[PDB]
Amino acid sequence: KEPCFREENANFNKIFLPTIYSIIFLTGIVGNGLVILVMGYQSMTDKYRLHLSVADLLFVITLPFWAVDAVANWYFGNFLCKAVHVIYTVNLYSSVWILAFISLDRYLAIVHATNSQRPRKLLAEKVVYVGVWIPALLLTIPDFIFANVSEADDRYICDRFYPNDLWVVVFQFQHIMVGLILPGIVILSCYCIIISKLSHNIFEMLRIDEGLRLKIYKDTEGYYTIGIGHLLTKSPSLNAAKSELDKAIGRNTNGVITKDEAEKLFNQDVDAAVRGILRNAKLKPVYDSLDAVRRAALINMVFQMGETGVAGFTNSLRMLQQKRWDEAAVNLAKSRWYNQTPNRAKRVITTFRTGTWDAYGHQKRKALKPTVILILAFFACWLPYYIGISIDSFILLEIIKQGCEFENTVHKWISITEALAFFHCCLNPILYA
């Protein structure tokens, strides 16, 4: 088995790569630079992005070398050859793992909001160095060792040359693992726990406003109801109300239910309510523009007065959508809703104005939307490469044998997709838009 031969491609090396490397460099060198002088001199989530943008900067200033390597030759000696591969290893590890810390930061700010102000500080001021940089720096060791200049085809090249396939497969596996899989699992874990907390927050909100009822209750209109405003039956029968509650919870209650059960039932009613909103020309656009906390505000209103009801606030709705909070609050402040149930209204309105739980600690808003976009964007960038190098390592192991046209096509995908990945530098600056 002689190795598969692939041709070098001129247009790729001579036109395509230098083009991309330049665009990225320009939009990168300025974008991160502005982030560093603005955000650097003159919010925890910004702190991490300061780091991130330093990690990307250090990379972009390496691209001119990458480019002249692509077209011509490696003119720059062996120290700079090592430095180029080193920086790269630091960036791609630090860059993703800083995101994980951002995700942990959110987990702490949201799941443990009551008092996690401390551990969030140490994560940002101290741990970040012990858990991101130093370990990034120690992982460059192999680059110092194996990154060397080689003479090949009347020019110089700057490659990592390891001893053998045994080495290569292991580090290529370490690369996948440390590069996506691990930090991915961290991120996804953080995400999962937050959405669980987000929906429990809603539950506590309607607990105050609509009230938690653990025993079957006859409301002012004679309807039988349990939990958080969940109507069981309109019928006169206590025995009918008793008969529904059992069918709803799935056991033989005697007209009482537990805290866990009230909530499971409440979550179902949130689900249905949210599906209604997504299927409503008026409410969908407004709900989509809003954040986690303000969604909760809208969901409250629906629960009280039904979605048609809420869709009637033409004016206030259009302000909410347009993010003009105070004007939304003053309109709603004078409505039939406000007179009939004024304390609930005022809290729900304060929520719409502030985007915090001050009506339920003061002025403490913590946003997710910008972070979620950063991370997803970041992985969208790298994902194709990593699918690429997976398949490449499946070939190395001989899990998939398919001749040279396949092997060579996979190599080609990796080159394209590696180059396109480098756009992850700019995501950070751009997203400040």
Binding site: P3, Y88, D159
Partner: peptide
């Protein structure tokens, strides 16, 4: 090129 190596008398890289 990041994944080069020695296979017997051959130099290879894994591409990328």
């Amino acid at each position: 090129r990041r994944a080069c190596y020695q296979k017997x008398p051959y130099r290879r890289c894994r591409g990328x």
